[PDB]
A paper describes a structure:
The protein, termed Pa Dps, adopts the Dps subunit fold and oligomerizes into a nearly spherical 12-mer quaternary structure at pH 6.0 or in the presence of divalent cations at neutral pH and above. The 12-Mer Pa Dps contains two di-iron centers at the interface of each subunit dimer, coordinated by conserved His, Glu, and Asp residues. In vitro, the di-iron centers catalyze the oxidation of Fe2+ utilizing H2O2 (not O2) as an oxidant, suggesting Pa Dps functions to aid P. aeruginosa to survive H2O2-mediated oxidative stress. The Pa Dps structure harbors a novel network of Tyr residues at the interface of each subunit dimer between the two di-iron centers, which captures radicals generated during Fe2+ oxidation at the ferroxidase centers and forms di-tyrosine linkages, thus effectively trapping the radicals within the Dps shell.
To test this idea, we crystallized Pa Dps from a solution containing 0.5 mM MnCl2 (Dps-c-Mn). The Dps-c-Mn structure is nearly identical to the Dps-c-Fe structure (RMSD = 0.40 Å, 1834 residues).
Numbering used by the authors:
A (entry chain H), B (entry chain B), I (entry chain G): 1 to 156
C (entry chain L), D (entry chain E), E (entry chain D), F (entry chain F), G (entry chain A), H (entry chain I), ...: 1 to 155
The structure:
């Protein structure tokens, strides 16, 4: 059945392309957070195990909301290692860094996602897509909050 | 007691007029969806009965939220058959269509509400009512997501 | 599939027609109650706002149970403004009455549903349909209780 | 301790006999519904696996409610394969029907129990046993609704 | 405001009177079960302390439902020691019986409520007060069930 | 088994006697509150019906707790219309006052229970019984709270 | 679709056959427990009525789990009076035994399931069906624990 | 660690300054609402006690949400009587006014927070901070809705 | 309508006055703890953010309980910045201290409330206002427990 | 950091010593209640297994609250076999008594702990330690109630 | 701190290696299931969207359990696209297959995890790592059960 | 009543001996963890007070499960300081060590329970006591997981 939601097909394709990078970034940050949840050690173990658990649990929900916005725009949601490797601007950590470096990478991850969200608004303006803009706004809120909580641990 | 929320009375009345049409369209969709929930048959009965139940439940809450924004703006919320028939842009189904045609009508219903929501933004531009804009954006989000779920059923 | 529940076709039809009137009254009362829930003002705002909330919430469940009794009997459940306007015995209010007039209208609404339910028992006796008689009994219980709470506000 | 609930011992024995057949039909339908839940296949697996689970779960409670009404009347509740095979009017399915034949057998199961329940209201009439009449009424409402949901799948 | 629930004023007055006696017997049984919950002793303490708890908990709700049916009919609900002793047909226990005698009195108490309930159905036949008839049926069902559970301890 | 809790038989018996007046006042206030819940009318119906419900709900748990302190002290908990009408200092109301008068009686009822609890303290300040002292404290806290909420309605 | 879970058709068939006996014993025990739950009398009514409720509630879940393991192995799950009566090793009880004999039979029921469970293990080692082995293990744990709680009543 | 969220430091300081006045007005209204909750009296006591309780509970969460947006922007959240008295645009009530005047001041208070929220938007246009805009929008929605509920009490 | 709860006006007023001071210390500690919850940083961010959250949540309920005892005694409960500044004995912190100083101040705050509570008892002994006595006793138990948990963090 | 709760070190060390015996009694009773829960047999198995479970569950919480009041006072909490063995006035039971004797020993235990509670109140008076006085008062309330329920089994 | 759990470093490392492949397969099945949840269309949208939701939700918990078992063995858990792609035996789908093909791949994906689980058991036998054995057993049980439900949709 | 679960009395007694040791190690760890929960200090207070709370809460449930496995085997469960101190292989700590030494001891407690569980397995091979093997497996899984979390804190 044809889609008549007030946005033409190529404009929807462009928004979906942006949301696909956002999904890729969000999912890469999900897996990294999950990874650090399992692997962190040192005297901060209990606090960071729990903190990273709260984060990966939140991100798992965010990946589902982003992917379904893509579907609501009429396009397939990417969901493979190859697609996420290709589309993600966040780099993965292949080793087991010290707790402090883990916190530092996650701060940078939050901020990388904010960057990707900001990059999509020029498009939404010209095309007019308030739901997508509200989605990006919610992700920016969560990641900026999460970044304050993470960097606060590094404060002198 | 005089209302001092930063919007003049005739501008509030224009917004309320717009939200009254959105409320009638949402209410008409609610009862149609409820109707189809009762009356659908065929091998998709269990899945459509449940699916339309989720939708009518969500719309029941949406009708209350839209009505209460009208009240927040200092105007009465319409709430009769005659007001909704007059204000709605969606047509009712008096008979019992096939399940496929139920699904198609509900897809068109989602899209009709999105169009009514959009028609209110030019007003909100000129006037400046962020809460109402957030409400329209939420309804657009729900209806565009529901449209994807409904139209997926028809894919061949 | 054939319907073999011990009630014949014309009989089920006549019961369904009675329940359609009850559904139409119940649904009209639901919307009137929803409407007064939004629009009531005055010093009783908070209690009436909340009380009309409990009522429309209960009525929304009752509409689903009446509708689905109609379906168990083998007939489509009506569900449009036109069908309810034709079938319904409750006069609609297009303005915003004072709080005490809203209460009276709702009392009269409760009693209209009861009057419609009572209107169906003569048929049910003849026909024998204990589930529908029990549905009508449950609705009469609710509407009579709700009528006492409403009219109590007017004393 | 003697039982003085306003119904004599042989009248209670007779109500217990009717309830014992109702219990055997309800229990046979419970096990068949449980069987079909486990064994149904095809594209309707997810929807029927779930639907038959709602039904068999509802029926486990019904068996306990019927059986304890028999106890309330002063009589033992039957509860063996042999007892239920003897009292049941519902035929058993020893194989694995296609999904549609499962839906159809279960519609007829619903209508069988309603038949058994209807057969009992004469007696309860004569001896004015209002609890047992309410129990039969609730079982009929359930099975008639279920039969509509089942048969809707075959339309 | 006028009461127009389809039952004239004199008929409601008489049903209200029946229910007032049902309420007094239910409340009296309520306070006796409560009394025995506190006061039972012996090797059955745990079983009966808990069993009598479930019973008074249930009856507390029963008294509220009965009283509000009276209110729905347009009449004040009695609720003093003096009204209940006058209206009650159950006699209270001023002492502290042995466990077995507590059980026997509670059994008898269940059957006394069932009796007061049956006393009422005649007033309902004339006017088809189905809500009240369902209320009585539910109380009869609860007390007949509880009688079985209590009397079972004496076998 | 002998009760060895560091309070002597006569002293316990004197506490039981005081707690028994507390129970009688609490139970009499419970039933008065219940009564007024059912019977209040007027524009404040919703607020008072709900307010009195919360009050009566809380006292029912309190009667159980007062009564079980008496049993902990080795004595029977009173539980009859006669025994409460004797011990209670709450004048019962046999008719249906105006809502404002219901509120006043209920205020006085809170104060009555506190007056009784206070009367029991001399006895406690000669015997060492911290649990009974804490129970009296909890009741006074609740009834003084309740009295403020009640009297506020009258300002 | 072919089944490739690492066990070949014949072995899956042999394991499903043992699980079918386990299902039958478990289901028969379920019904006998359900039966004794309804039918026990005497001083221990309250305690055995609840104890047998807990057990049959657990066994109803167990029948589902065993049946679905049979489906996971690729075979249909038996589910008729005739099929359980043939496969079961538990003797049914058509009467109403005394409370202690009900306990005694339910003890022996637990031990017959264990016996059946143990008979299946030789087969599983051969093919290393670990999920089936864990299933048997959990049922044995539950039945051994229930046995202890039941026989404790007879010490 | 450097803050790289796409907003410069002085731009963040200006947003934080605006949000610090939003926080001060929100906290001042929280406390005023809490105060009126404790202190209101008259026949509306029950409904305003509860309504003001809904409001202060919601505002308590709002104060935490606003303060943590400030922290997300990299600045300290104000949290003293002196800081809030300096930054607040809302005056406190030091006495105990009549219920109507309490309602009037809470209306004025809702509308004061809306004006403060509105005042911050020009900054967010120029700078680009969508999260803060969404926070402002949610506060505006809550206070405008609450203003309707409150002022409806005065119609 | 009169108040006859076995205590006279002049005595209730004296108790209300002492509970007014308790309310003011409890609120000032409430606000201080909330402040530290938002504002604490360092490697202990997570544990202290969470710990101060539990405390400010508890204290919010205590202020409601103290305030309504005053009301039960027949007097208006104070609730303004100025009323609490005047009546309170806790020193407010206008800055953002290091985490260890935040802990130390919150210990002192616990003890300050206890000190205020002890000072009221004499006045209850005369008239046997047992409810107020039990209220004080409960606050003392919470604050002394909270003080132990706080000071255990400083131990070396 | 220094402790300044209005109670000097010597007085706090004396209270700790008392609470340390109360804790060793409470714990010893906790393990003994726990032990009898596992090991009781006979026809009261179900009722006592469940009664002892409720009791030990309660005692496990009480041990934590006693230990942590000892930390609030500024002293370590004992927590080993040797410490509890040294401090406990509760005699341990190394075999498996019969149910009646288990009931007896647990009644003794409730009363032993009440006795230790009482022994500490003089200190608390001297120094005014109201929190610890309320802890003891709560233990005594629970143990005196529990003893009533246990000894009731022996009547 | 040294790891002394009865298994040496080299053996723990070999098991960790095996569990790393189990993690990779399980995470790959996780993401594919998640993908088919978003992307499936056609008449089965509603049932498959929900079924795949239940599956991916269960696998999210499973990956956490397998990861933490590797950590309990003393080794890092892998957690990157490259590491999972290297270790996984499941082939990713880069397109959007038809619903039936999605079902078919999810069946094979269930069977591939079982295949990997089986391959690990020898290394466990030679050292008596019973917790890892039980983890593998639980995964096989979930996956064989899920394969039955999936393949049933294709009959 | 004889015990017939497939294991001889000599064998069941030997298994109950192994589990008595396990029960003793588990209770000893339980109390030590509970002790450290109360007594730990320093900058890790909040994290370790919480972590040790979760651990003792879990071990308290574990002791009940191990005790009741012994009762399922037909032997009494030990439960006194002297029985546990005799059987326990875990050396207690009578002082208050530094937080890090508390962690290290709790690591060794975990591994000591694992050591005792492993000693028991042979005796279960000879006999096929599957429930007991699974209980040990579960305990091993919990302790080896808790060990990783605890030793992680020391990295
Ligand atoms: Mn989803
Ligand atoms: Mn609403
Ligand atoms: Mn429905
Ligand atoms: Mn039952
Ligand atoms: Mn009521
Ligand atoms: Mn009780
Ligand atoms: Mn199932
Ligand atoms: Mn916060
Ligand atoms: Mn409050
Ligand atoms: Mn603790
Ligand atoms: Mn985890
Ligand atoms: Mn246990």
């Amino acid at each position: 059945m044809e889609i008549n939601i007030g946005i033409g097909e190529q404009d929807r394709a462009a928004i979906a392309e942006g949301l696909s990078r956002l999904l890729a970034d969000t999912y890469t940050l999900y897996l990294k957070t999950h990874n650090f949840h399992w692997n962190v050690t040192g005297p901060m173990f209990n606090t960071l195990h729990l903190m990273f658990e709260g984060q990966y649990t939140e991100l798992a929900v965010a990946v589902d909301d982003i992917a379904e916005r893509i579907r609501a725009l009429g396009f397939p949601a990417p969901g493979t290692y190859a697609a996420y490797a290709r589309l993600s601007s966040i780099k993965e950590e292949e080793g087991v860094p010290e707790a402090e470096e883990m916190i530092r990478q996650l701060v940078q991850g939050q901020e990388a996602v904010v960057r990707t969200a900001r990059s999509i608004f020029p498009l939404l303006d010209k095309v007019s897509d308030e739901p997508t803009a509200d989605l990006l706004t919610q992700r920016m809120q969560v990641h900026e909050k999460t970044a304050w909580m993470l960097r606060s641990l590094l404060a002198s």
